[PDB]
Amino acid sequence: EPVVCYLYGKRGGGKSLTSIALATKICKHYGVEPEKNIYTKPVASDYWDGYSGQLVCIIDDIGDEDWSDFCQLVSGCPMRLNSSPFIIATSNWSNRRLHFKVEVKPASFFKNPHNDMLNVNLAKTNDAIKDMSCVDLIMDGHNVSLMDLLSSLVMTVEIRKQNMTEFMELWSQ
Numbered sequence: 001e002p003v004v005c006y007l008y009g010k011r012g013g014g015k016s017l018t019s020i021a022l023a024t025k026i027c028k029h030y031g032v033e034p035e036k037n038i039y040t041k042p043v044a045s046d047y048w049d050g051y052s053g054q055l056v057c058i059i060d061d062i063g064d065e066d067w068s069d070f071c072q073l074v075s076g077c078p079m080r081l082n083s084s085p086f087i088i089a090t091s092n093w094s095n096r097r098l099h100f101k102v103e104v105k106p107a108s109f110f111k112n113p114h115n116d117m118l119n120v121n122l123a124k125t126n127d128a129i130k131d132m133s134c135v136d137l138i139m140d141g142h143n144v145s146l147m148d149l150l151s152s153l154v155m156t157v158e159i160r161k162q163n164m165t166e167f168m169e170l171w172s173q
Contacts, residue, residue, distance in 0.1 A: 001077055001084045002074065002077050002084040002085060002086070002087050003084075003086060003087070003098060003099070003100075003153060003156060003157055003160075004074055004087045004088075004089060004097070004098075004099045004100070005022065005086070005087070005088045005089070005099070005100045005102065005149070005153060006088075006089045006091070006094070006099055006100060006101045006102065007019055007022075007088060007089065007090050007091070007102050007104050008090070008091045008092065008093055008094050008101070008102070008103055008104065009092070009103055009104040009105050010092070010105065010116065010117075011092070011117070012115070012117030012118060013104055013105045013106060013116070013117060013118060014104045014105065014106055014118040014132075014134070014135040015090045015091075015104040016060070016090060017118070017120070017129075017132070017135070018102075018104050018132055018135055018137070018146065019040075019058050019060075019088045019090050020038070020040075020058070021129075021132050021146060022088060022146065022149065022150060023038045023040075023056040023058060023086075023088060024038070025146065025147075025150050026055065026056050026086055026150065026153070026154075027055055027056060029150065029154055030055060032055050036054070037054045037055035037056055038054055038055075038056050038057075038058065039051050039052075039054035039056070039057045039058070039085070040057070040058035040060060041058075041059070041060065042059075042060045042061050043059050043060065043061060043062045043063075043066045043069055043070050043073065043089075044069065045069055045072070047059065047073050048073065048076070048077070048078055051078060053080050053081055053085075054085060055080070055085060055086065056085060056086045056087075056088065057077075057085045057086065057087050057088070058087075058088045058089075058090065059073060059087065059088070059089045059090070060090050061090065061091070062089055062090065062091035062092075063091075063092065070089065074087065074097075086153070086157075098156070100139065100149065100152065100153065101139065101140075102137050102138065102139045102144070102149060103136075103137070103138040103139075104135055104136070104137060104138075105135070105136050105138070106118040106119065106134065106135060106136070107128075107133065107134055107135055107136050109122075109126075109134075110122055110123050110126075110128065110134040110135075118134065118135065119134075120134075122134075131145070131146060131147065132145075132146040133145070137149060
């Protein structure tokens with residue numbers, strides 16, 4: 001049902017900021033108010049209870065084995081009313097359906113020297129927040145931009161907006 005974008009990396013490495021940036025860019029793409037269309041909560045069995053139709057859902061800090069819990073959340077995702085929400089998951093580490101796995105770490109210039117975390121002040125002054133160029137996004141082995149990721153997610157949604165998945169299975173045999 002839902003396209004899951006899976007962002008992982010070290011604490012304070014930029015995965016959280018990126019999840020929100022991606023979330024709001026998804027909302028802007030679809031002509032929708034971000035502050036009303038981002039449902040973000042730490043992973044938990046009652047994650048969906050407070051949900052009320054936000055376009056984008058963020059499932060945070062998938063740690064303490066939380067992966068079985070998060071697998072349930074995806075399989076049991078509710079519907080929307082435009083028909084699935086985008087799902088962004090964050091986690092310290094990586095690791096079967098249609099998904100995007102993206103490692104998030106600071107771009108070399110913006111890695112804090114004291115700790116290997118993201119220097120958000122420096123990214124701010126360097127106008128590197130708007131496009132999240134302050135961050136390295138690593139997907140299928142290579143660096144990718146936030147807009148590339150957004151564009152890829154939106155396109156595969158448009159692909160599934162058609163009702164082709166059955167035929168694509170057939171065509172793929």
